[PDB]
Design an enzyme around this catalytic site. Structure first.
Site, mmCIF file in Angstrom:
data_model
loop_
_atom_site.group_PDB
_atom_site.id
_atom_site.type_symbol
_atom_site.label_atom_id
_atom_site.label_comp_id
_atom_site.label_asym_id
_atom_site.label_seq_id
_atom_site.Cartn_x
_atom_site.Cartn_y
_atom_site.Cartn_z
ATOM 1 N N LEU A 1 0.711 -1.162 -0.265
ATOM 2 C CA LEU A 1 -0.148 -0.029 0.062
ATOM 3 C C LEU A 1 0.840 1.288 0.023
ATOM 4 O O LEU A 1 1.921 1.165 0.545
ATOM 5 C CB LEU A 1 -0.829 -0.242 1.376
ATOM 6 C CG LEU A 1 -2.029 -0.995 1.189
ATOM 7 C CD1 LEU A 1 -2.820 -1.090 2.258
ATOM 8 C CD2 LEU A 1 -2.575 -1.060 -0.044
ATOM 9 N N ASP A 2 0.338 2.240 -0.527
ATOM 10 C CA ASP A 2 1.123 3.546 -0.689
ATOM 11 C C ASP A 2 1.161 4.409 0.496
ATOM 12 O O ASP A 2 0.885 3.898 1.707
ATOM 13 C CB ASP A 2 0.362 4.544 -1.953
ATOM 14 C CG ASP A 2 0.367 3.769 -3.088
ATOM 15 O OD1 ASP A 2 1.384 2.860 -3.291
ATOM 16 O OD2 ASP A 2 -0.543 4.043 -3.920
ATOM 17 N N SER A 3 1.641 5.676 0.447
ATOM 18 C CA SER A 3 1.464 6.654 1.634
ATOM 19 C C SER A 3 -0.064 6.905 1.787
ATOM 20 O O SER A 3 -0.250 7.117 2.989
ATOM 21 C CB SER A 3 2.562 7.618 1.337
ATOM 22 O OG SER A 3 3.867 7.460 1.134
ATOM 23 N N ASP B 1 -2.787 5.042 0.502
ATOM 24 C CA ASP B 1 -3.752 3.839 0.377
ATOM 25 C C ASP B 1 -4.117 3.333 1.916
ATOM 26 O O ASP B 1 -5.121 2.808 2.452
ATOM 27 C CB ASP B 1 -3.325 2.807 -0.515
ATOM 28 C CG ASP B 1 -3.640 3.216 -1.827
ATOM 29 O OD1 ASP B 1 -4.441 3.987 -2.087
ATOM 30 O OD2 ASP B 1 -2.816 2.700 -2.694
#
Ligand SMILES: CCCCCCCCCCC(CCCCCCCCCC)(CO[C@H]1O[C@@H](CO)[C@H](O[C@@H]2O[C@@H](CO)[C@H](O)[C@@H](O)[C@@H]2O)[C@@H](O)[C@@H]1O)CO[C@H]1O[C@@H](CO)[C@H](O[C@@H]2O[C@@H](CO)[C@H](O)[C@@H](O)[C@@H]2O)[C@@H](O)[C@H]1O
Ligand SMILES: CCCCCCCCCCCCCCCCCC(=O)OC[C@H](COP(=O)(O)OCCN)OC(=O)CCCCCCCCCCCCCCCCC
Lengths: 90, 85, 106, 82, 50, 48
Positions: free
Chosen positions: B41-43, B45
């Site tokens: 997961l992203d920063s 998400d």
């Protein structure tokens, strides 16, 4: 050569009784605040805001309620009234 | 009434993350899984899933407590800390 | 004001949590909301690749002001929580023995 | 704070009803409904406007018209059967 | 003040020894409601407008 | 003896807990202050 006499035997003064334990944690900030609020008058100084409030509440408001009170002494009865009857004496 | 348990929080958060699209796999999910590294997961998400987790448990999170729940076990312990369900 | 870092990350995550929550109470429908939230997400996806600090801070406080224009009168709060209506109904009294002040009567 | 708001609005109206009630007992000399309504048509209209103005500011305070209308919806902090 | 920071009294939103302001009881929890969504001069205009 | 009674009542006959007790004032406030005040009520009502 002048000392109060030898037949004194003076002792300490208590206030007597029961050491009531502390039911309150005093706050330094609240105590300093309240001591500043009760003794405000020894640091009060006249400024423009003081002059405005001292003009309006000690001089202007008594004069206004004074004029209203002296004009309206014997003007009004409403005691027994009718249609077409004026209620002002003047 | 209705009182949650620990395994209830477990199977709510696991089914929650199974609903989510931008996970890596539905099979690598554990209690100790990092949302950032293990789930891919992203920063931003991880923030959308903290939004969905706080809507899902019916509870509100300040910004100081949202970033701290990096792994899933920290989220389960943190959500179990509050009295509201 | 700064490129890729943990504090800029904390700022942008906080602003995204805001923009989601802020959009949440304007919109009554589920469908229009989740469309709108995907759009909002696409606005954050089009950005977040900006190299300089100048245009970064420009778009940053511009979307902060754009975030300030769409503020809502009452945020949806859960009731047991400090915006709510169930907050502090029966807070349980802490267990205290009685302090006494008089030697003679209670 | 909500009960405070409600009572102080109602007390605004209570003060204007005390004004109106003092004028009632001055003009008619009584407070009974039967004597006041029997002699209401004789009394001067300006007095009548003054009295019903004060009693309407009282009624407007408790029956929640626009001059102070907040306290009804600021009384939802009390529960549902209340 | 935000409500989620831990205070000594949660209801007062105040730490144990924190200096109290010049004219405190207007900045109290028991103070007025003090709305924040409109500027007060603007809200004056909107009210008198309606 | 007064100090030894009340200090021991505060810290801890001592080791009991009952209800029946007469504080020093209740002799001449319930039996003189209260009936003279009821007598003031009765004479105001019938003097009216
Ligand atoms: C219409 C205008 C009429 C003119 C009058 C206004 C008047 C009399 C009010 C008394 C009312 C009497 C009440 C009786 C009731 C009637 C029946 C109020 O003058 C006061 O005005 C106040 C506000 O303006 C100031 O308060 C605070 O200020 C700041 C401090 O940090 C804060 O920034 C501010 O926030 C505070 O508020 C005071 O400093 C000032 O003394 C006098 O003003 C005049 O007098 C003198 C004497 O003092 C003033 O002092 C000078 O200031 C020194 C540097 O300051 C200089 O070195 C020195 O040369 C000289 O001493 C003058 O300036 C002048 O103005
Ligand atoms: C035909 C003519 C029609 C006329 C219609 C127009 C009428 C408009 C006049 C409205 C006057 C309303 C009555 C004013 C007194 C009401 C006091 C009150 O209600 O205080 C509320 C306040 C708490 O309220 P708040 O904290 O804001 O919200 C709580 C909800 N969580 O409680 C507190 O905080 C307590 C401390 C503040 C108390 C107030 C202190 C100042 C009182 C000033 C009274 C002024 C009376 C004269 C008004 C003149 C108006 C022209």
């Amino acid at each position: 050569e002048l000392k109060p006499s030898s037949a004194i035997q003076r002792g300490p003064l208590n206030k007597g009784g029961w050491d009531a334990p502390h039911a309150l944690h005093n706050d330094g900030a609240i105590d300093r605040y309240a001591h500043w609020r009760t003794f405000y008058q020894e640091r009060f100084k006249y400024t423009r805001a003081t002059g405005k409030s001292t003009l309006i509440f000690l001089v202007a408001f008594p004069a206004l309620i004074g004029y209203v009170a002296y004009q309206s002494e014997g003007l009004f009865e409403f005691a027994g009234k009718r249609r077409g009857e004026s209620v002002t004496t003047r | 009434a209705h009182v949650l348990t620990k395994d209830m929080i477990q199977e709510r958060i696991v089914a929650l993350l199974e609903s989510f699209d931008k996970v890596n796999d539905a099979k690598n999910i554990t209690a100790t899984a990092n949302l950032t590294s293990d789930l891919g997961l992203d920063s931003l998400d991880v923030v959308e899933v903290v939004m969905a987790i706080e809507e899902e448990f019916g509870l509100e999170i300040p910004d100081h407590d949202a970033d701290e729940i990096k792994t899933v076990q920290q989220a389960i312990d943190y959500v179990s800390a509050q009295p509201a369900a | 004001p700064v490129p890729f870092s943990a504090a800029n990350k904390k700022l942008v995550t906080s602003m995204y949590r805001q923009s989601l929550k802020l959009a949440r109470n304007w919109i009554s429908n589920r469908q229009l909301f989740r469309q709108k939230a995907v759009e909002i997400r696409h606005k954050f996806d089009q950005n977040a690749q900006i190299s300089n600090p100048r245009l970064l801070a420009r778009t940053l406080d511009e979307t902060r002001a754009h975030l300030y224009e769409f503020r809502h009168p009452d945020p949806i709060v859960p009731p047991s929580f400090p915006g709510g209506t169930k907050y502090e109904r029966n807070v349980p009294p802490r267990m205290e023995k009685i302090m006494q002040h008089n030697l003679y009567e209670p | 704070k909500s009960a405070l708001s409600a009572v102080l609005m109602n007390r605004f109206g209570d003060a204007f009803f005390v004004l109106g009630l003092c004028v009632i007992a001055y003009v008619f000399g009584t407070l009974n409904y039967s004597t006041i309504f029997a002699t209401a048509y004789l009394i001067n209209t300006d007095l009548l406007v003054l009295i019903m103005l004060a009693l309407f500011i009282a009624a407007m305070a408790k029956s929640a018209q626009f001059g102070l209308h907040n306290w009804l919806t600021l009384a939802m902090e009390g529960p549902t059967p209340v | 003040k935000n409500p989620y920071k831990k205070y000594d009294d949660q209801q007062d939103r105040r730490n144990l020894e924190e200096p109290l302001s010049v004219n405190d009881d207007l900045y109290d929890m028991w103070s007025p409601d003090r709305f924040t969504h409109f500027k007060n001069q603007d809200a004056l205009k909107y009210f008198i407008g309606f | 003896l007064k100090d030894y009674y009340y200090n021991g009542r505060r810290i801890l006959w001592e080791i009991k807990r009952e209800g029946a007790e007469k504080e020093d004032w209740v002799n001449q406030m319930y039996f003189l202050y209260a009936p003279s005040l009821i007598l003031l009520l009765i004479v105001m009502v019938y003097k009216s």
